[PDB]
């Protein structure tokens, strides 16, 4: 194989997700993202059916990359003496929902609904493939600004979906549910619904609802922008203090606020082009 079948461009960003660069597969000029992760900072390993000891990120990505989906797919990966290199796809042009929100503030409800729905679909896809992301938040969502398609990234805190209790979390705290904060115990679907509630508030209000543990535990959400009563109702339902009082994915997509979603292309024509 050997690594210079891609051409390396600018550093796109770096953080707990590793360092990610803009790249082009030389074979067919396909845009790509080259992620490097140091082996030293991988706490969670898995194995590939074949028998190789890989990072869990790569196991989870292989399971969800069957494609097509609203997940950025893993096209190839490589081992190095001190790091793994992952070759993922890259939309052009692209902006992460975090930067998009920093720039435009609270999103119009019709835009939030398209975006949230598409997130719901991607999260359904991961669950349907046996993958829990465990760090759903605006920084982990890419927008393809031409097609209006959202795409999920950075599965480094994810786990295989399981029906028993999780006692380990390494996601973002301010998107984590009260039962983790208080007891260090959660279940996959209900924690994911909670973070989908923090995301939905984030989109309609321009910011996350809670910063502090005490605020999460209390679960009382104040609205700082004018948000519709139906949208407020769905947000508060995802943010219920008791996991069992949170909605299923089906109940979210059957909520009256989620009816008449725009299709991605209309979404980009109306809210994203020019
Ligand atoms: C979290 N945030 C700093 C995003 C970093 N900027 C970018 C820009 C474009 N792409 N295109 C694919 C990716 C990708 C990131 N991880 N896996 C794929 C990517 N990241």
The two beta strands, 6-15 and 45-47, are: unpaired
3-state SS assignment for residue 195: helix
Q: What's the resolution in A?
A: 2.3
Q: Whose CA is closest to atom 5 on ligand 1?
A: 13
Active-site residue, 135 included: yes
Q: Contact 66/78 with Cβ under 8 angstroms?
A: no
* Among 196, 67, 50, 42, CA closest to 119: 196
144 lines ligand 1 (CB under 6 A): no
The response to whether 35 counts as a known ligand-binding position is yes
CA distances from residue 1 to 6, 79, 135, 183 in whole angstroms, order as listed: 11, 11, 32, 47
The response to whether 67 counts as a known ligand-binding position is no
**Cβ contacts of 78 within 8 Å, gap of 6 or more:** 1, 3, 84, 85, 87
Q: Could you please state the CATH topology (level 3) that the domain comprising 93-274 is classified under.
A: Transferase(Phosphotransferase); domain 1 (1.10.510)
Which is it for the CA torsion 262, 264, 266, 267, positive or negative?
Answer: positive
Two tokens, residue 100: 């998009």
Q: Rounded to the nearest 5°, which phi and psi values hold at 23? A: -150, 165
| From 76, 135, 138, 213, active-site residue | 135
**Cβ contacts of 151 within 8 Å, gap of 6 or more:** 70, 71, 72, 91, 122, 141, 142, 143, 144
CA terminus-to-terminus distance, the chain: 41
**Cβ contacts of 106 within 8 Å, gap of 6 or more:** 203, 204, 205, 206, 225
Q: Contact 127/59 with Cβ under 8 angstroms?
A: no
* Among 171, 162, 135, 133, CA closest to 56: 133
DSSP assignment, residue 232?
Answer: H
**Cβ contacts of 155 within 8 Å, gap of 6 or more:** 57, 60, 61, 64, 131, 133
Q: How far apart are CA 221 and CA 236, in angstroms?
A: 7
Q: How far apart are CA 111 and CA 268, in angstroms?
A: 9
User: In the chain, what's the furthest Cα-to-Cα distance?
Assistant: 56
Would you tell me which CATH number, out of the four given (3.40.50.2300, 3.30.200.20, 3.90.1150.10, 3.30.365.10), belongs to the domain 1-92? 3.30.200.20
List, in sequence order, every residue forming a beta bridge with 255; answer none if it has no partner: none
Q: Contact 203/185 with Cβ under 8 angstroms?
A: no
Report which ligand 1 atom has the smallest distance to the Cα of 91.
11
Percent of the chain as helix, strand, coil, to the nearest 5: 40, 25, 40
Q: Could you tell me the distance, in angstroms and rounded to a whole number, from the CA of residue 152 to the centre of ligand 1?
A: 9
Q: Contact 125/79 with Cβ under 8 angstroms?
A: no
* Among 117, 81, 124, 127, CA closest to 203: 117
Q: How far apart are CA 148 and CA 152, in angstroms?
A: 13
Q: How far apart are CA 227 and CA 244, in angstroms?
A: 25
* Among 142, 210, 228, CA closest to 172: 210
20 lines ligand 1 (CB under 6 A): yes
HEC profile for 76-101? Answer: EEEECCCEEEEEEECCCCEEEHHHHH
Instruction: Name the residue ranges covered by the structural domains of the chain.
Output: 1-92, 93-274
Q: How far apart are CA 12 and CA 175, in angstroms?
A: 24
**Cβ contacts of 74 within 8 Å, gap of 6 or more:** 58, 61, 62, 65, 86, 87, 88
* Among 1, 11, 61, CA closest to 34: 11
Q: How far apart are CA 74 and CA 62, in angstroms?
A: 7
**Are 1-92 and 93-274 equal in CATH topology?**
no
Q: How far apart are CA 244 and CA 32, in angstroms?
A: 40
Q: Could you tell me the distance, in angstroms and rounded to a whole number, from the CA of residue 145 to the centre of ligand 1?
A: 14
The response to whether 12 counts as a known ligand-binding position is yes
Report which ligand 1 atom has the smallest distance to the Cα of 72.
18
Q: How far apart are CA 167 and CA 251, in angstroms?
A: 26
């Amino acid at each position: 194989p050997l690594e210079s079948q891609y051409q390396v461009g600018p550093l796109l960003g770096s953080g707990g997700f590793g360092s990610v660069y803009s790249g082009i597969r030389v074979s067919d000029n396909l845009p790509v993202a080259i992620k490097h992760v140091e082996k030293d900072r991988i706490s969670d390993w898995g194995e590939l059916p074949n028998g190789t000891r890989v990072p869990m990120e790569v196991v989870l990505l292989k399971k969800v990359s069957s494609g097509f989906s609203g997940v950025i797919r893993l096209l190839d990966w490589f081992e190095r003496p001190d790091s793994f290199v992952l070759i993922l796809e890259r939309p052009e042009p692209v902006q992460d929902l975090f930067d998009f929100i920093t720039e435009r503030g609270a999103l119009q409800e019709e835009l939030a609904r398209s975006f949230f729905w598409q997130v719901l679909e991607a999260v359904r896809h991961c669950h349907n493939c046996g993958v829990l992301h465990r760090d759903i938040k605006d920084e982990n969502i890419l927008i393809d600004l031409n097609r209006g398609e959202l795409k999920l990234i950075d599965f480094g805190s994810g786990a295989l979906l399981k029906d028993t209790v999780y006692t380990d979390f390494d996601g973002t705290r301010v998107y984590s549910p009260p039962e983790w904060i208080r007891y260090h115990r959660y279940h996959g679907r209900s924690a994911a619904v909670w973070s989908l509630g923090i995301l939905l508030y984030d989109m309609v209000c321009g910011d996350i609802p809670f910063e502090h543990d005490e605020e999460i535990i209390r679960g009382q959400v104040f609205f700082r922008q004018r948000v519709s009563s139906e949208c407020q109702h769905l947000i508060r339902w995802c943010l219920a203090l008791r996991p069992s009082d949170r909605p299923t994915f089906e109940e979210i997509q059957n909520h009256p606020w989620m009816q008449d979603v725009l299709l991605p292309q209309e979404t980009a024509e109306i809210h994203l082009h020019s």
